[PDB]
Design a protein around this nucleic acid. Structure first.
Lengths: 65, 136, 386
RNA sequence: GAACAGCCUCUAGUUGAUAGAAUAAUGUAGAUAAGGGAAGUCGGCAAAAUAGAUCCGUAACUUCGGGAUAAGGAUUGGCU
RNA sequence: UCUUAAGGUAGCCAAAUGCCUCGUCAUCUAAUUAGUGACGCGCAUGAAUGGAUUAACGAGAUUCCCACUGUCCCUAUCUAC
RNA sequence: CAGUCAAGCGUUCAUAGCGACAUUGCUUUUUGAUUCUUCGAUGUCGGCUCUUCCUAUCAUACCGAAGCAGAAUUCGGUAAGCGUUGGAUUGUUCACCCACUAAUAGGGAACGUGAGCUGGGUUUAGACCGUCGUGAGACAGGUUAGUUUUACCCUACUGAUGAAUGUUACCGCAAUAGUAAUUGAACUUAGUACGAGAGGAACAGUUCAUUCGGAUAAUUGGUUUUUGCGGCUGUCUGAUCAGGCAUUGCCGCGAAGCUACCAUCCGCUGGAUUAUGGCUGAACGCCUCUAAGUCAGAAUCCAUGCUAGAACGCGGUGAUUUC
């Protein structure tokens, strides 16, 4: 058992939960749930969605780990 | 499906009922495949024979080379786009459903595969797995 | 004229009548055939359906594509605190079936089980088994003699037990009491087993072992009145039909001039007694230890109740049982686990299951963390934390 | 807003349609649906899709007036 | 030459007119008693009982295609009454 | 649709498979013949939907025969347990192709089924054409448009209550009724048996799948009046904050519940038998599966198991009302 990371929200994907998506370029995208999957499919930026790990890292909030 | 089956396949969600146009993912010259039958499909009243990843369908070419058009040929589904789950437990899908033209024995008419190819289809048909670029 | 195109009939005729079950607790219609070589053992247990979770296990079967490979399986968690033995009944065989000869009970009855014999318990004098207990407190004035009768007669002896639902987190406070047959040894051994176990609790680790295919008996989830389309799965009538399309079009030929018993009709859906078979035991967990959900591959101190509790049930602080797959009944419902009536091999009953990881993320939504420690380690400091 | 369109208000006028409780099946009127996309059916019936404005582009045919909003593309807010 | 005077001309056609007939050929489809284009000894087409054609128009009838979709695979859920 | 006889076909050979000339029947799924019922009306084609039934068995089980080496096949028996499909054209039943399939068997039930639907056709009234008629008009000739009503009654069915064997409560028993599983592929046996080769099995063992069924909601998907959170338009509340209204104003996400072969889980093992193959063994000094007796044996039957529990079937057990 190894845990996956959301390709949009950077969240921890535990087995069975979430979804997998393969693009035409064979780029595998893993989503924790329908929220991340749907926001991805409407072509939104994780850097511009406020609650995402990418947004957190870009705005430098919570980098003490 | 049938005699030319290399291995068994777990049940995959049927996403390609009769009448589905799927992309052609090989270099045979066909542009798309129109599913008209599914090999090994069951029999129920008022139930469409539907296809999934890796099973042989009997298809026609509606767009593509004239010498591939107007005839009936076997094809194999390599991408589904209808999310199915693996015994791993993950639900996955591609963004489009695509297949490749093959003879009844499972030998592919084309020489190469464009785009990703499902693991179940790869494991059922080694020729598809050989000519394929990426297997997921 | 014949049916133009053949089709299988909708629904199983062997489950009729699709009516409400006579009680919320499903009885065991048939118990395993008794032996004599085997020791005296209970052949069933009573627990409560708490909810479902997910497990990951390293599937092994020599010839499948998933040999020595991780598989994700739905499991149902049944909260099973030890059941209390209070009483035993002997059944003598007669040319008309098994007939109960007598029921001997225990000196002291818990208020939880005594609450079962009442419909208005609070506004009562609690006069229940008082004269029976008065008959007790002597050696065998009416006890040892009745047990001797059960030994001399009564080819079948069944122990009366009840559930500890004060331990269970339900709002019930009324113990479910049922009968479990004893299927070992002689009648004397069964009877004095029961007598020795009077007023005593027995836990699941004695009845059911890990990697055991048991049967589940429960009353399925009820749904009230249902139309034929969802109650039997008949085809929906086309879009343009006067007077509704969620019906069966023809409910019979002209002759016989009656509606047959086998035509699909609307009525009660669900709330039926069902016994499903061959449910594998994935783990027999004890509440008298932390790290219920800890495996030899995870090794994380963590109980089995998910974050936020089991939805609509709560916590599993008691003993519990992991049954693979789904079982009849909904959450909070008393289920009965029964030993198998036959020894199956299947290369599936004798599959040795050892769990690798069992999910405890919150079932009350899309849960991301298994432990609040994990939640804190991910989020960090929150404004609610000082 | 192009608009005695639709939508919301002012003056004025009504607040009149037997009610209370519950939320079963089947309805009537509205909706939404993964993948497929007419395989349904006598038949795309019903529904959906399109839709305003600006700019671009617009075929056969023709009674030279049309076809034509043909087909087919793009843009559209707020603020300075 | 005969019958009642003339003997179906231009055209058009398995046409809303063709029995045979699901006519034959081509095309459209994987497959077409459908459609279209041809053919025509045409049961029983045909010239103001108007023939042929025809842009534009049509809540007229028919076929195919693209788009779209719960029409369907195969159902499910929600609201008001 | 099925027999009987057997000239003959079948390299020879009447019956492996067939069988002319004849002849005996059965069926009521064709169509006639009739005119008994109904003209103070039995709704009148087909399709769709759904249940059951028959067997004259297409497939699946087990078998016997062959012109059965194998594979495929053909003939036949017990067998209706179980299934018998998706489409193009046609209103069509019937056809006819394209395919999948283990198979795409034939039928009945008021030519099942219109207070179940639809209304494509037929078969009112409008209209066009062809032929016929002087004409009005005719045409099982073509074409186009053409109102499909009522259940609240009784019964049947599906569910749901319920009086009364002192009362009340708990745990049970089990008469009777229903019953359910199904089919395929792959690996292996095995490139083996068999066969000159070409080709080419089967039993046992594993892995899946089809159709069906019963549950369940961990996960994924669907649904959104959680009008939960956010966004947006128009207007109204002097502005801001918060809101109203736009018949749920619209959009994104959306828990819970419900729910999907669109998701997961589960679907048992014993005995009697049918065909059929035998043992012993007479009849009939020999033979002979049969006569007495008997062994095995099918998707069969009955049990095991599963569903209900007789509301006029029953048992055991607790409590049983006093100023």
């Amino acid at each position: 058992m190894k845990v996956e990371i959301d390709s949009f929200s950077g969240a921890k994907i535990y087995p069975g939960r979430g979804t997998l998506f393969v693009r035409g370029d064979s780029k595998i995208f893993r989503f924790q749930n329908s929220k991340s999957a749907s926001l991805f499919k409407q072509r939104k930026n994780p850097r511009r969605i406020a609650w995402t790990v990418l947004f957190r890292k870009h705005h430098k909030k919570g980098i003490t780990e | 499906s049938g005699n030319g089956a290399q291995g068994t396949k777990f049940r995959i969600s049927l996403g390609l009922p009769v009448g589905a146009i799927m992309n052609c993912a090989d270099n045979s010259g066909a542009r798309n495949l129109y599913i008209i039958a599914v090999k090994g499909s069951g029999s129920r009243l008022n139930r469409l024979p539907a296809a999934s990843l890796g099973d042989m369908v009997m298809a026609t070419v509606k767009k593509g080379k004239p010498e591939l058009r107007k005839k009936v040929m076997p094809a194999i589904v390599v991408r589904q786009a209808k999310s199915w789950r693996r015994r791993d437990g993950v639900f996955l899908y591609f963004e489009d459903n695509a297949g490749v033209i093959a003879n009844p024995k499972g030998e592919m008419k084309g020489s190469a595969i464009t785009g990703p190819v499902g693991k179940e289809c790869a494991d059922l048909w080694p020729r598809v797995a050989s000519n394929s670029g990426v297997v997921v | 004229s014949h049916r133009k195109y053949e089709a299988p009939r909708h629904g199983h005729l062997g489950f009729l009548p699709r009516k409400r079950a006579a009680s919320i607790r499903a009885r065991v219609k048939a118990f395993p055939k008794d032996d004599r070589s085997k020791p005296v053992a209970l052949t069933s247990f009573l627990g409560y359906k708490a909810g479902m979770t997910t497990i990951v296990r390293d599937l092994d079967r020599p010839g499948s594509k998933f040999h020595k490979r991780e598989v994700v399986e739905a499991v149902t968690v049944v909260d099973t605190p030890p059941v209390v033995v209070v009483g035993v009944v002997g059944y003598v065989e007669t040319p008309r079936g098994l007939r109960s000869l007598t029921t001997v009970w225990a000196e002291h009855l818990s208020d939880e089980v005594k609450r079962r014999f009442y419909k208005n318990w609070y506004k009562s004098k609690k006069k229940a088994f008082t004269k029976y207990s008065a008959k007790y407190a002597q050696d065998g004035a009416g006890i040892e003699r009745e047990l001797a009768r059960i030994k001399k007669y009564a080819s079948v002896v069944r122990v009366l037990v009840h559930t500890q639902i004060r331990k269970t987190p339900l709002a019930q406070k009324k113990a479910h009491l049922a009968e479990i047959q004893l299927n070992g040894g002689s009648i004397s051994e069964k009877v004095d087993w029961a007598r020795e176990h009077f007023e005593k609790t027995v836990a699941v680790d004695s009845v059911f072992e890990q990697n055991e295919m048991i049967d589940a008996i429960a009353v399925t989830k009820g749904h009230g009145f249902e139309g034929v389309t969802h109650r039997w799965g008949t085809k929906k009538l086309p879009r343009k039909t006067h007077r509704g399309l969620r019906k069966v079009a023809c409910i019979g030929a002209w002759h016989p001039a009656h509606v047959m018993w086998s035509v699909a009709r609307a009525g009660q859906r669900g709330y039926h007694s069902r016994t499903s078979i061959n449910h594998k035991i994935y783990r027999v967990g004890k509440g008298d230890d932390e790290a219920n959900g800890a495996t030899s591959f995870d090794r994380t101190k963590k109980t089995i109740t998910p974050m936020g509790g089991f939805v609509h049930y709560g916590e599993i602080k008691n003993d519990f049982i992991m049954v693979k797959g789904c079982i009849p009944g909904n959450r909070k419902r008393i289920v009965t686990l029964r030993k198998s009536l036959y020894t199956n091999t299947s290369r599936k009953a004798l599959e040795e299951v050892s769990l690798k990881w069992i999910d405890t993320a919150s079932k009350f939504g899309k849960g991301r963390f298994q432990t609040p420690a994990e939640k804190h380690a991910f989020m960090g400091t929150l404004k609610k934390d000082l």
